[PDB]
């Protein structure tokens, strides 16, 4: 069996394989999360468009369990492995504790899997970041992010993938009590954030919501393009 040390330090304290994994994430499609008051929303760019594609087969938003879903940016094949590992873990947790996982619990599990792949012989790190959302037993909504290093944090809102830096800048100015006062504006805040980088803007954009107790609802190209037009014509007016 193959035991080469793959992730090692370089002179100035860098772990280059981890940085390179982070470059893979940056070339992925943009993904955005916003934590509402009693909703949580995930939106993600494109994949491709491509008329001949079966839409169903390439979603970048994925249920891990009934009360937790995730989006990712980066290597899709790598993401599928992490997702499956997490799904297995959600069933062990229910098995041994007889509760659903918290969003933090499973975030922590994913993060530590990723960290291990940065310190174990024979393996490269995973080239993905994940936005993980849901609700805890007491109804508190949650948005967590992990990255290839195994670092994880909670966020009010965030973006990962290509154009994350400008999308994050947009969210910093635009995430306020007023922007998330209702479900519709929360959803629109995500779409506006994506329209900030998305190369065409219409569809393009896959979107999903999670309501307290209500489990994952994906939208809906007809319902999305309502919000798209409603934002496009507002961004014309301003000029």
């Amino acid at each position: 069996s193959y035991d080469r040390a793959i992730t090692v330090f370089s002179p100035d304290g860098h772990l280059f394989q981890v940085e390179y994994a982070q470059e893979a994430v940056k070339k992925g499609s943009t993904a955005v999360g916003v934590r509402g008051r009693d909703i949580v929303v995930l939106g993600v760019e494109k994949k491709s468009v491509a008329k001949l594609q079966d839409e169903r087969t390439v979603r970048k938003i994925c249920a891990l369990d009934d009360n937790v879903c995730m989006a990712f940016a980066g290597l899709t094949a790598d993401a599928r492995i992490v997702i499956n590992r997490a799904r297995v873990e959600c069933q062990s947790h229910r098995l041994t504790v007889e509760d659903p996982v918290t969003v933090e619990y499973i975030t922590r599990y994913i993060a530590s899997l990723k960290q291990r792949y940065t310190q174990s012989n024979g393996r490269r790190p995973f080239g993905i970041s994940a936005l993980i959302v849901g609700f805890d037993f007491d109804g508190t909504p949650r948005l967590y992010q992990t990255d290839p290093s195994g670092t994880y944090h909670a966020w009010k809102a965030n973006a990962i993938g290509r154009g994350a830096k400008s999308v994050r800048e947009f969210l910093e100015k635009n995430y306020t009590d007023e922007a998330i006062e209702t479900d519709d504006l929360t959803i629109k805040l995500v779409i506006k954030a994506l329209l900030e980088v998305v190369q065409s803007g219409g569809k393009n954009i896959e979107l999903a919501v999670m309501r307290r107790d209500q489990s994952l609802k994906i939208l809906n190209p007809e319902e999305i393009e309502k919000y798209v037009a409603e934002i496009e014509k507002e961004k014309e007016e301003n000029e």
Partner: protein, 248 residues
Amino acid sequence: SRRYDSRTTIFSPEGRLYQVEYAMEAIGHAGTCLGILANDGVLLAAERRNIHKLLDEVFFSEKIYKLNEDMACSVAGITSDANVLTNELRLIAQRYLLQYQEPIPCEQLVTALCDIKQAYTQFGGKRPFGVSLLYIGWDKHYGFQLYQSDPSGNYGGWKATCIGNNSAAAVSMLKQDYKEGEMTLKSALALAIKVLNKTMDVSKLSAEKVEIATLTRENGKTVIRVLKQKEVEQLIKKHEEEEAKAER
């Protein structure tokens, strides 16, 4: 030892996986292979490279593989690598059947293989498999289906697509001709021959040079058939008759 290791499963500075990419160049030079979904079936059509010589003709196809009762695939890339992967696909399908006593739904079979391909890009220090596949199938969850997988361990579902030589050109022609929700096996066959006619720069297209398999449903049973050369010639003739009415 560290001196001789290729390091096939590591990232490059842009977050790339070079081997995977390089495998994808191997695929792009291999025989063109297309798949087309219709309302009443799915098909695979492939350029033959074992074509011809003093070759003997001993199997029912060159690059079309039956995977189980309800599924077939074609391949582009390294042939020996394709043999290992199609063998593994058959095993996965039989493991699933053994366990559940029902056929493996198409996407699940694709996924299972893609996890093996993925692993080869993340650990073990081995070269990846130099193969892309097209999968056709029927199951009770989504009916007629067509998938494509590549050495990255990525896959997707398609209504029509192409891999191997001149793929980009083949997909452009499919983008423009394919009628979402309205194709039949008979019109998909016509389109497949149209597409291979343009993308084979070995000039005069011939039945000895292509392979077509159809997958249909009859009396609650999946039927997978490699078309005989009589039928392939006949479709080539109809395509040639069809080119003009365009002219006056």
